[PDB]
Short mmCIF file of C-alpha atoms and ligand atoms in Angstrom, two decimals:
data_model
loop_
_atom_site.label_atom_id
_atom_site.label_comp_id
_atom_site.label_asym_id
_atom_site.label_seq_id
_atom_site.Cartn_x
_atom_site.Cartn_y
_atom_site.Cartn_z
CA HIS A 6 14.70 13.23 -47.23
CA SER A 7 18.37 13.22 -46.07
CA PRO A 8 21.37 11.39 -47.09
CA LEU A 9 21.84 8.36 -46.29
CA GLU A 10 24.83 7.95 -43.90
CA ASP A 11 27.12 4.94 -43.02
CA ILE A 12 26.95 2.65 -40.21
CA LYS A 13 27.70 3.84 -37.26
CA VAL A 14 27.55 -0.27 -34.85
CA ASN A 15 27.42 0.62 -31.23
CA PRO A 16 28.12 -2.91 -29.78
CA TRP A 17 26.91 -2.95 -26.22
CA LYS A 18 23.55 -0.73 -27.13
CA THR A 19 21.20 -3.92 -25.97
CA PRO A 20 18.30 -4.35 -29.20
CA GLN A 21 14.50 -4.14 -28.38
CA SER A 22 13.09 -7.48 -27.03
CA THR A 23 11.02 -9.30 -29.73
CA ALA A 24 9.38 -11.63 -26.62
CA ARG A 25 5.98 -11.69 -26.88
CA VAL A 26 4.01 -10.95 -23.02
CA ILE A 27 0.81 -12.39 -22.20
CA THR A 28 -0.59 -11.54 -18.50
CA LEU A 29 -3.80 -14.21 -17.39
CA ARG A 30 -6.22 -13.13 -14.54
CA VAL A 31 -8.54 -15.89 -13.81
CA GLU A 32 -10.78 -15.02 -11.43
CA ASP A 33 -12.90 -17.61 -9.20
CA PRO A 34 -10.73 -20.76 -10.54
CA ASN A 35 -11.98 -23.78 -9.26
CA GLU A 36 -8.89 -25.06 -7.45
CA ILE A 37 -7.32 -21.64 -5.68
CA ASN A 38 -3.82 -21.57 -6.52
CA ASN A 39 -1.95 -19.39 -4.03
CA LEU A 40 1.31 -19.21 -6.59
CA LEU A 41 2.46 -16.36 -9.13
CA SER A 42 3.42 -18.32 -11.96
CA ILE A 43 5.77 -16.24 -13.94
CA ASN A 44 6.73 -18.39 -17.73
CA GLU A 45 9.23 -17.77 -19.61
CA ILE A 46 8.19 -20.01 -22.87
CA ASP A 47 8.97 -20.21 -26.25
CA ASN A 48 7.82 -22.77 -27.29
CA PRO A 49 3.78 -22.17 -26.46
CA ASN A 50 3.30 -25.94 -26.54
CA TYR A 51 4.77 -26.59 -23.38
CA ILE A 52 2.34 -23.75 -21.88
CA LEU A 53 0.12 -26.80 -19.96
CA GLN A 54 3.04 -28.97 -18.49
CA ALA A 55 4.31 -25.25 -16.95
CA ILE A 56 0.75 -25.17 -15.27
CA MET A 57 0.89 -28.52 -14.91
CA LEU A 58 4.49 -28.09 -12.69
CA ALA A 59 2.57 -25.29 -10.64
CA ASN A 60 -0.48 -26.97 -9.61
CA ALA A 61 2.07 -29.55 -8.23
CA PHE A 62 3.73 -27.64 -6.00
CA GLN A 63 1.17 -25.97 -4.86
CA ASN A 64 0.68 -28.31 -2.25
CA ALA A 65 3.95 -27.82 -1.56
CA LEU A 66 2.70 -24.74 0.23
CA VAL A 67 2.53 -25.21 4.55
CA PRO A 68 0.69 -22.96 7.10
CA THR A 69 4.37 -20.85 8.99
CA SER A 70 4.80 -21.22 12.87
CA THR A 71 2.10 -19.29 14.62
CA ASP A 72 4.54 -16.34 16.40
CA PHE A 73 4.95 -15.96 12.26
CA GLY A 74 1.21 -15.31 11.47
CA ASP A 75 -1.26 -16.94 9.62
CA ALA A 76 0.25 -17.22 6.83
CA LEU A 77 1.18 -19.45 3.69
CA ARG A 78 4.28 -20.26 2.68
CA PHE A 79 6.25 -23.16 -0.39
CA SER A 80 8.95 -25.12 1.68
CA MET A 81 11.32 -26.78 0.06
CA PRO A 82 11.40 -29.87 2.18
CA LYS A 83 8.17 -30.17 1.14
CA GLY A 84 8.40 -29.88 -1.80
CA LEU A 85 11.30 -32.54 -2.23
CA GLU A 86 8.22 -34.57 -1.31
CA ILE A 87 5.86 -33.70 -3.98
CA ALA A 88 8.88 -33.44 -6.45
CA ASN A 89 9.14 -37.52 -6.39
CA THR A 90 5.10 -37.79 -6.95
CA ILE A 91 4.68 -36.32 -9.73
CA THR A 92 4.43 -37.19 -12.99
CA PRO A 93 5.77 -37.89 -15.80
CA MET A 94 8.73 -37.70 -12.86
CA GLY A 95 11.60 -36.32 -13.54
CA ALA A 96 14.93 -34.71 -11.10
CA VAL A 97 15.81 -32.18 -8.11
CA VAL A 98 18.71 -30.66 -9.48
CA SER A 99 18.79 -28.20 -6.56
CA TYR A 100 16.91 -26.65 -3.58
CA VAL A 101 18.64 -24.00 -1.32
CA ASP A 102 16.76 -23.11 1.98
CA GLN A 103 18.49 -20.08 3.46
CA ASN A 104 18.07 -16.51 5.73
CA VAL A 105 19.64 -13.29 4.39
CA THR A 106 19.52 -9.98 6.68
CA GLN A 107 20.54 -6.11 6.61
CA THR A 108 20.83 -2.92 8.66
CA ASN A 109 19.45 -0.18 7.33
CA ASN A 110 19.98 -0.48 3.76
CA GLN A 111 18.62 0.20 0.86
CA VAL A 112 15.49 -2.11 -0.65
CA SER A 113 17.37 -2.43 -3.85
CA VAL A 114 20.24 -3.74 -1.87
CA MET A 115 17.64 -6.86 -0.91
CA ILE A 116 15.94 -7.53 -3.63
CA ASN A 117 20.77 -7.53 -4.75
CA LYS A 118 20.98 -9.85 -1.91
CA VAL A 119 17.83 -12.20 -2.89
CA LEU A 120 18.96 -12.46 -6.67
CA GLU A 121 22.54 -13.72 -5.85
CA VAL A 122 20.39 -16.39 -3.77
CA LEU A 123 18.05 -17.14 -6.89
CA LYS A 124 20.86 -16.28 -9.65
CA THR A 125 22.95 -19.64 -7.89
CA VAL A 126 19.28 -22.07 -7.42
CA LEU A 127 19.46 -21.19 -11.70
CA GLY A 128 22.84 -20.96 -12.47
CA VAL A 129 24.75 -18.86 -14.84
CA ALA A 130 23.21 -19.19 -18.22
CA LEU A 131 19.39 -20.36 -16.95
CA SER A 132 19.99 -16.96 -14.63
CA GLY A 133 20.62 -15.05 -18.44
CA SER A 134 17.41 -16.50 -20.15
CA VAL A 135 15.01 -14.85 -17.80
CA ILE A 136 17.13 -12.01 -15.76
CA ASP A 137 14.74 -9.37 -16.81
CA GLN A 138 11.72 -11.62 -15.20
CA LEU A 139 13.50 -12.51 -12.40
CA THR A 140 14.89 -9.24 -11.63
CA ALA A 141 11.30 -8.13 -11.91
CA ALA A 142 9.94 -10.36 -9.80
CA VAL A 143 12.59 -10.30 -7.10
CA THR A 144 11.30 -6.69 -6.93
CA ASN A 145 7.79 -7.51 -6.72
CA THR A 146 8.27 -8.94 -4.11
CA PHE A 147 9.89 -6.35 -1.45
CA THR A 148 7.78 -3.32 -3.52
CA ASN A 149 5.09 -2.46 -5.55
CA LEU A 150 3.03 -4.54 -2.76
CA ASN A 151 -0.26 -2.16 -2.85
CA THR A 152 -2.05 -4.28 -5.84
CA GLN A 153 -0.91 -6.79 -4.70
CA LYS A 154 -1.47 -6.79 -1.61
CA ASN A 155 -4.94 -8.84 -1.55
CA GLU A 156 -3.48 -11.82 -4.08
CA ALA A 157 -3.51 -15.43 -3.66
CA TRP A 158 0.09 -15.46 -3.82
CA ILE A 159 0.98 -13.04 -0.91
CA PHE A 160 -0.37 -13.45 3.09
CA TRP A 161 -0.12 -10.71 5.60
CA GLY A 162 0.77 -11.97 9.14
CA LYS A 163 2.05 -10.45 12.50
CA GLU A 164 1.72 -6.57 12.44
CA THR A 165 3.64 -4.43 15.07
CA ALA A 166 4.04 -1.01 15.18
CA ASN A 167 8.27 -1.84 14.38
CA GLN A 168 7.63 -4.57 12.16
CA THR A 169 5.80 -6.59 9.63
CA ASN A 170 5.30 -10.09 8.84
CA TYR A 171 4.76 -11.63 5.55
CA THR A 172 4.79 -14.22 2.64
CA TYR A 173 5.31 -14.38 -1.08
CA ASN A 174 5.39 -16.93 -3.21
CA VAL A 175 6.39 -17.01 -6.35
CA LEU A 176 6.85 -20.54 -8.98
CA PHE A 177 9.13 -19.62 -12.28
CA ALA A 178 9.31 -22.10 -15.59
CA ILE A 179 11.56 -22.10 -17.88
CA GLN A 180 11.98 -23.30 -21.13
CA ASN A 181 14.30 -22.29 -23.77
CA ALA A 182 17.51 -22.77 -26.03
CA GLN A 183 19.49 -22.86 -22.28
CA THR A 184 16.94 -26.06 -21.26
CA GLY A 185 17.01 -27.79 -24.14
CA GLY A 186 15.00 -31.52 -24.03
CA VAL A 187 13.95 -31.00 -20.05
CA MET A 188 11.04 -27.76 -18.48
CA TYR A 189 12.86 -26.32 -15.64
CA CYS A 190 10.22 -25.12 -12.68
CA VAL A 191 11.64 -23.41 -9.55
CA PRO A 192 9.14 -22.38 -7.32
CA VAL A 193 10.53 -19.83 -4.10
CA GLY A 194 8.93 -19.41 -0.81
CA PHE A 195 9.97 -15.88 1.00
CA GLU A 196 9.17 -15.48 4.67
CA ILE A 197 9.52 -11.83 4.91
CA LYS A 198 10.02 -9.73 7.85
CA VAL A 199 10.66 -6.37 7.44
CA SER A 200 11.52 -2.96 10.21
CA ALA A 201 8.11 -1.34 9.05
CA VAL A 202 4.49 -0.59 9.39
CA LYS A 203 2.33 -2.44 7.36
CA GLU A 204 1.14 1.14 5.70
CA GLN A 205 4.68 1.93 4.52
CA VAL A 206 5.95 -0.98 3.50
CA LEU A 207 3.07 -0.89 1.12
CA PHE A 208 4.50 1.95 -0.46
CA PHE A 209 7.68 0.64 -0.23
CA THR A 210 9.94 1.36 -3.46
CA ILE A 211 13.87 0.60 -3.87
CA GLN A 212 14.87 3.83 -2.79
CA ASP A 213 13.26 3.56 0.88
CA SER A 214 15.96 2.06 3.90
CA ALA A 215 14.87 -0.43 5.65
CA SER A 216 16.28 -3.82 7.76
CA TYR A 217 14.63 -7.46 6.73
CA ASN A 218 15.26 -10.90 8.59
CA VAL A 219 13.89 -13.45 5.28
CA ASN A 220 14.02 -16.57 4.84
CA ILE A 221 14.18 -18.18 1.17
CA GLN A 222 13.08 -21.62 0.53
CA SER A 223 13.31 -22.95 -2.93
CA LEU A 224 14.43 -25.93 -4.89
CA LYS A 225 15.17 -26.76 -9.51
CA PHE A 226 13.31 -29.72 -10.72
CA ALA A 227 13.95 -30.65 -14.60
CA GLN A 228 10.92 -32.52 -16.23
CA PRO A 229 11.25 -33.90 -19.34
CA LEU A 230 9.65 -31.99 -21.52
CA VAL A 231 6.37 -32.59 -23.37
CA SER A 232 5.19 -30.95 -26.25
CA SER A 233 0.61 -30.38 -26.12
CA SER A 234 0.15 -29.37 -29.08
CA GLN A 235 -2.82 -32.46 -29.78
CA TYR A 236 -4.43 -32.44 -26.96
CA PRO A 237 -7.76 -29.62 -27.05
CA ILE A 238 -7.61 -26.01 -25.50
CA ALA A 239 -10.62 -27.88 -22.71
CA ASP A 240 -7.30 -29.87 -21.35
CA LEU A 241 -5.97 -26.31 -20.74
CA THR A 242 -8.38 -24.37 -19.28
CA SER A 243 -8.53 -27.76 -16.93
CA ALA A 244 -5.11 -27.39 -15.77
CA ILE A 245 -5.39 -23.74 -14.97
CA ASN A 246 -8.51 -24.94 -12.76
CA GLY A 247 -6.42 -27.18 -11.26
CA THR A 248 -8.53 -30.12 -11.61
CA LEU A 249 -6.82 -31.77 -14.77
CA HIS B 6 -5.31 -24.38 22.69
CA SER B 7 -7.37 -21.36 23.68
CA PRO B 8 -10.92 -20.95 23.50
CA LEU B 9 -13.03 -20.17 21.15
CA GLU B 10 -13.90 -16.67 20.95
CA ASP B 11 -17.47 -15.49 18.95
CA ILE B 12 -17.15 -14.08 15.61
CA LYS B 13 -15.97 -10.21 14.94
CA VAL B 14 -17.23 -9.59 11.77
CA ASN B 15 -15.00 -6.90 9.90
CA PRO B 16 -17.49 -5.40 7.39
CA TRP B 17 -14.82 -2.83 5.39
CA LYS B 18 -11.55 -5.66 5.84
CA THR B 19 -11.22 -7.18 1.69
CA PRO B 20 -10.77 -11.37 1.79
CA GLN B 21 -7.70 -12.14 0.02
CA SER B 22 -8.56 -13.41 -3.64
CA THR B 23 -8.85 -16.22 -4.72
CA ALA B 24 -7.86 -15.50 -8.63
CA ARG B 25 -4.95 -17.44 -10.19
CA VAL B 26 -2.30 -15.08 -11.91
CA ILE B 27 -0.40 -16.66 -14.50
CA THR B 28 2.42 -14.59 -16.43
CA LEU B 29 3.83 -15.91 -20.23
CA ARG B 30 7.10 -14.53 -21.88
CA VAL B 31 7.10 -16.18 -25.32
CA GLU B 32 10.49 -15.48 -26.71
CA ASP B 33 10.87 -15.00 -29.99
CA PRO B 34 7.20 -15.42 -31.72
CA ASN B 35 7.46 -16.07 -34.74
CA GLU B 36 5.41 -12.13 -35.39
CA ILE B 37 5.97 -9.94 -33.21
CA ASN B 38 3.43 -8.43 -31.46
CA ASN B 39 4.00 -4.26 -29.81
CA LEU B 40 1.24 -4.46 -26.82
CA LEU B 41 1.12 -5.49 -23.94
CA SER B 42 -1.65 -8.79 -23.78
CA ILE B 43 -3.07 -7.80 -19.76
CA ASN B 44 -6.13 -10.35 -19.50
CA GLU B 45 -8.80 -10.52 -16.74
CA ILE B 46 -10.82 -13.64 -17.82
CA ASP B 47 -12.82 -15.96 -15.77
CA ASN B 48 -13.59 -18.70 -18.54
CA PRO B 49 -9.74 -19.99 -19.94
CA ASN B 50 -11.83 -21.73 -22.72
CA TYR B 51 -11.61 -17.32 -23.94
CA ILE B 52 -8.36 -16.73 -23.46
CA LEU B 53 -8.06 -17.73 -27.47
CA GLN B 54 -10.19 -14.97 -28.24
CA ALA B 55 -8.52 -12.54 -26.08
CA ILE B 56 -4.93 -13.65 -27.87
CA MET B 57 -6.53 -13.33 -31.45
CA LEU B 58 -7.95 -9.78 -30.29
CA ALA B 59 -4.46 -8.17 -29.48
CA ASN B 60 -3.19 -10.33 -32.42
CA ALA B 61 -5.65 -8.02 -34.71
CA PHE B 62 -5.02 -4.21 -32.95
CA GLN B 63 -1.17 -5.06 -33.57
CA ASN B 64 -2.15 -4.05 -36.82
CA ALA B 65 -2.91 -0.32 -34.92
CA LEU B 66 -0.18 0.59 -34.43
CA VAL B 67 1.80 3.58 -36.27
CA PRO B 68 4.50 5.55 -36.06
CA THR B 69 4.84 8.71 -34.28
CA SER B 70 6.11 12.19 -36.33
CA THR B 71 10.18 12.39 -36.22
CA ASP B 72 10.04 15.63 -33.81
CA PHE B 73 8.58 12.43 -31.59
CA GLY B 74 11.48 9.95 -31.77
CA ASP B 75 11.74 6.09 -33.76
CA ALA B 76 8.14 5.54 -32.20
CA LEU B 77 5.60 3.28 -32.68
CA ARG B 78 2.09 3.36 -30.60
CA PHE B 79 -1.69 2.57 -30.69
CA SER B 80 -3.80 4.68 -33.07
CA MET B 81 -7.18 5.19 -32.40
CA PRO B 82 -8.34 6.31 -35.95
CA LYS B 83 -6.55 3.17 -37.32
CA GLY B 84 -7.83 1.54 -34.72
CA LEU B 85 -11.34 2.12 -35.93
CA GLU B 86 -10.41 1.38 -39.29
CA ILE B 87 -9.29 -1.91 -37.76
CA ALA B 88 -12.03 -2.54 -35.49
CA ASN B 89 -14.35 -3.14 -38.62
CA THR B 90 -12.48 -5.53 -40.39
CA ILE B 91 -12.33 -8.09 -37.20
CA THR B 92 -14.15 -11.27 -37.57
CA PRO B 93 -16.27 -12.64 -35.78
CA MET B 94 -17.70 -8.91 -36.62
CA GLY B 95 -17.84 -6.40 -33.62
CA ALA B 96 -19.03 -3.71 -32.24
CA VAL B 97 -17.17 -0.36 -30.97
CA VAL B 98 -18.28 1.26 -28.01
CA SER B 99 -16.15 4.35 -27.17
CA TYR B 100 -12.87 5.79 -27.94
CA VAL B 101 -10.48 8.54 -26.45
CA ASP B 102 -7.94 10.66 -27.84
CA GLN B 103 -7.03 13.43 -25.05
CA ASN B 104 -3.80 14.92 -23.70
CA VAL B 105 -2.95 14.62 -20.26
CA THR B 106 -0.16 17.22 -18.22
CA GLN B 107 0.26 17.96 -15.02
CA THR B 108 3.51 20.36 -13.54
CA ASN B 109 5.77 19.25 -11.00
CA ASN B 110 3.82 17.38 -9.28
CA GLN B 111 3.88 14.27 -7.72
CA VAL B 112 3.76 10.44 -10.30
CA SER B 113 1.48 9.55 -8.58
CA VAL B 114 -0.77 12.41 -9.51
CA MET B 115 -0.11 11.04 -12.94
CA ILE B 116 -1.43 8.00 -12.96
CA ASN B 117 -4.27 9.40 -11.29
CA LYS B 118 -4.99 11.01 -13.91
CA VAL B 119 -4.75 8.28 -16.92
CA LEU B 120 -6.50 6.25 -14.53
CA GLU B 121 -9.59 8.71 -14.76
CA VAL B 122 -8.95 8.71 -18.75
CA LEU B 123 -9.29 5.08 -18.72
CA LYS B 124 -11.98 4.54 -16.14
CA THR B 125 -14.32 6.92 -18.53
CA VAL B 126 -13.63 4.60 -20.97
CA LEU B 127 -14.61 0.75 -19.04
CA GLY B 128 -17.17 2.18 -16.98
CA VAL B 129 -17.64 1.35 -13.48
CA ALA B 130 -18.90 -1.89 -13.48
CA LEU B 131 -15.85 -2.80 -15.80
CA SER B 132 -13.36 -0.27 -13.94
CA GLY B 133 -14.58 -1.78 -11.03
CA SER B 134 -13.88 -6.00 -12.22
CA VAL B 135 -9.88 -4.84 -13.30
CA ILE B 136 -9.72 -1.98 -10.99
CA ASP B 137 -5.87 -3.99 -9.68
CA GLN B 138 -4.50 -4.62 -13.09
CA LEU B 139 -5.77 -1.20 -14.51
CA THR B 140 -3.65 0.42 -11.89
CA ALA B 141 -1.37 -1.41 -12.01
CA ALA B 142 -0.74 -1.59 -15.35
CA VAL B 143 -0.85 2.32 -15.40
CA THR B 144 1.56 2.80 -12.58
CA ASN B 145 3.83 -0.25 -14.77
CA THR B 146 3.56 2.57 -16.98
CA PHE B 147 4.92 5.84 -15.70
CA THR B 148 7.38 3.58 -13.18
CA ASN B 149 9.11 0.46 -13.34
CA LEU B 150 10.35 0.99 -16.70
CA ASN B 151 14.06 -0.20 -15.61
CA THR B 152 13.33 -4.29 -16.19
CA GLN B 153 11.00 -2.97 -18.84
CA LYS B 154 12.99 -1.31 -20.97
CA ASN B 155 14.31 -3.19 -23.84
CA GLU B 156 10.40 -4.61 -23.81
CA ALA B 157 8.57 -5.00 -27.34
CA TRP B 158 5.48 -2.64 -25.87
CA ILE B 159 8.12 0.77 -25.43
CA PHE B 160 9.89 2.40 -27.62
CA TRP B 161 12.17 5.18 -26.79
CA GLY B 162 12.00 8.20 -28.20
CA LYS B 163 13.79 11.64 -28.22
CA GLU B 164 15.86 11.82 -25.44
CA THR B 165 17.48 15.56 -24.62
CA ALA B 166 19.00 16.98 -21.32
CA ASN B 167 15.18 18.25 -19.75
CA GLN B 168 13.42 15.77 -21.46
CA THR B 169 12.89 11.80 -22.37
CA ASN B 170 9.98 10.86 -25.09
CA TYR B 171 8.92 7.03 -25.02
CA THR B 172 5.52 5.35 -25.71
CA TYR B 173 3.88 2.50 -24.10
CA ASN B 174 1.69 -0.04 -25.67
CA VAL B 175 -1.05 -2.33 -23.33
CA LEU B 176 -4.21 -3.89 -23.54
CA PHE B 177 -6.62 -4.93 -21.46
CA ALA B 178 -9.04 -7.98 -22.79
CA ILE B 179 -12.16 -8.77 -20.55
CA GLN B 180 -15.10 -10.78 -19.77
CA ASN B 181 -16.19 -11.77 -16.39
CA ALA B 182 -19.68 -11.41 -15.00
CA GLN B 183 -19.35 -7.35 -16.21
CA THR B 184 -19.22 -8.63 -19.49
CA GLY B 185 -21.90 -11.23 -20.47
CA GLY B 186 -21.73 -12.69 -23.68
CA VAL B 187 -18.87 -10.30 -25.06
CA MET B 188 -15.78 -9.98 -24.24
CA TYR B 189 -14.49 -6.45 -24.43
CA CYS B 190 -11.22 -5.10 -25.33
CA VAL B 191 -9.15 -2.11 -25.04
CA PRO B 192 -5.61 -1.17 -26.93
CA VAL B 193 -4.03 2.47 -25.27
CA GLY B 194 -1.68 3.97 -27.55
CA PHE B 195 1.10 5.80 -24.59
CA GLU B 196 2.13 9.08 -26.12
CA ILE B 197 5.22 10.62 -23.29
CA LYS B 198 6.94 13.51 -22.41
CA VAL B 199 8.90 13.48 -19.06
CA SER B 200 10.33 16.53 -17.57
CA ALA B 201 13.64 14.42 -17.24
CA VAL B 202 16.57 12.79 -18.34
CA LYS B 203 15.94 9.17 -19.08
CA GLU B 204 18.78 7.93 -16.75
CA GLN B 205 16.43 9.62 -13.97
CA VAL B 206 13.24 7.89 -15.38
CA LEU B 207 14.26 4.49 -15.70
CA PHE B 208 14.11 4.84 -12.11
CA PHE B 209 11.42 6.76 -11.44
CA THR B 210 8.90 6.16 -8.30
CA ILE B 211 5.29 7.16 -7.48
CA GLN B 212 7.12 9.23 -4.65
CA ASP B 213 9.24 11.63 -7.44
CA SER B 214 8.31 14.54 -8.55
CA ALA B 215 8.09 15.42 -12.70
CA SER B 216 6.08 17.70 -15.09
CA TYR B 217 4.46 15.27 -17.96
CA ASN B 218 2.85 16.20 -21.47
CA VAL B 219 0.56 12.56 -22.50
CA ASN B 220 -1.15 11.69 -24.94
CA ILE B 221 -3.72 9.21 -24.42
CA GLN B 222 -5.86 7.06 -27.88
CA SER B 223 -7.65 4.53 -26.56
CA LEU B 224 -11.03 2.09 -27.84
CA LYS B 225 -13.41 -0.56 -26.75
CA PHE B 226 -14.66 -3.07 -28.45
CA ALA B 227 -17.23 -5.95 -27.86
CA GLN B 228 -16.68 -8.80 -29.45
CA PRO B 229 -19.48 -11.99 -28.61
CA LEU B 230 -18.14 -14.46 -27.63
CA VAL B 231 -16.36 -17.40 -29.34
CA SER B 232 -15.60 -20.84 -26.68
CA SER B 233 -12.24 -22.68 -27.71
CA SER B 234 -12.94 -25.26 -25.86
CA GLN B 235 -13.13 -28.29 -28.14
CA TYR B 236 -10.43 -26.34 -30.92
CA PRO B 237 -6.41 -28.50 -30.14
CA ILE B 238 -4.04 -26.02 -28.50
CA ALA B 239 -1.85 -26.26 -30.76
CA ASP B 240 -4.20 -23.15 -32.25
CA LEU B 241 -3.55 -21.16 -29.30
CA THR B 242 0.11 -21.99 -29.70
CA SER B 243 -0.44 -20.39 -33.47
CA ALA B 244 -2.44 -17.63 -31.98
CA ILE B 245 -0.51 -16.52 -29.75
CA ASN B 246 2.40 -17.39 -32.28
CA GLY B 247 0.58 -14.99 -34.96
CA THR B 248 0.33 -17.35 -37.87
CA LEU B 249 -3.43 -18.53 -36.96
NA1 NA C 1 18.02 -6.20 -15.91
NA1 NA C 2 -6.07 -1.05 -6.02
#
């Protein structure tokens, strides 16, 4: 019942997203998949294609060294080998195998360091389109670990009084305006040593301080798009199960 | 190359889950959906059914009072009305509309209070099967809000020097051993007042202290299962878009 004011437009205020977010936890899959699958898609007709890329790079996981512990991590080298075998055929655009370290800094700093590596792998345009999920995904690598601790993508290694070893395996599938005719796939294998006992790590936040020695292995894989709109849903159920 | 030791079995050590987790962020859906869709499924053939339940309860969102701010929240009453219209037909098993409050306690405490309400709605058996996602989902209602702040399920209301108002809309779809022949659907509308400015709230952790006044509105809806294995994927793309 008030008067209608003229428009004051703040060109910096970010508008609320219209993006729909759906998370699926698939109990007891026929075939085990140890990659957290994070998908940024504008056309659901490429969901099947995204899952099938995750199915493939499952074979690029490898055990860590015995001195690290009993863990699986995505290997950049084996990833390259596997990349070649994927059909429809496609190209490895970039790859990285790099150590990241820090001393007595906040976890937030470490997150930014890791983000800097994955942003280099994705590139500016690609980073921008997935910035929210990318940030959240790296955040959830170092914090929010309690609800994740027994999940299929995280593996705990050696556990001393001064240090905890663990691996974390996440995969990004991107298909939007910035990808055009290809879907991009970016698996990431984290091998993390952190200067805290597990009980503390399980409840680490961005405010907590810690020293890290971290190895990141990743690659970027473009696969030309293949719509699946005409295939039955049974084919998607099969891809999720890893039996397709 | 070591000797093979006899088995020492600790019956309390939780085994690593085999559950596959896939998150979809669907850019620019045809129809906007303001519910975070969290799905606990053992058979992907019921994914379509889960999305279609989320599509329906979108219509049960309502604006908050003007004094709260410009926000949408799932309404338990309107939910009941909408429940009746859903096909295939089904039953409202339980519903809640309850205030939860706390004074100068840790955020962790508040999370537990809310969890106690949603566990009452789900029941013991049902709670147990989805305990990890349920805990994470309530955790992400009060913390990890920075990467979420501009997403479609969270709305910011009035923002004073002493208080922040916001709503949070999440939906659980459950289909597993504990559900049998029905899928369960549990939408949740949070109306949250918290005794901190937004800048602080955006970076609240479980360790932070705050006073809350929170209204929770939810219901539990059983729908007999309908497999979609024979339908084309285009039908799933359509359900995601809200055009089916
Ligand atoms: Na961000
Ligand atoms: Na838990």
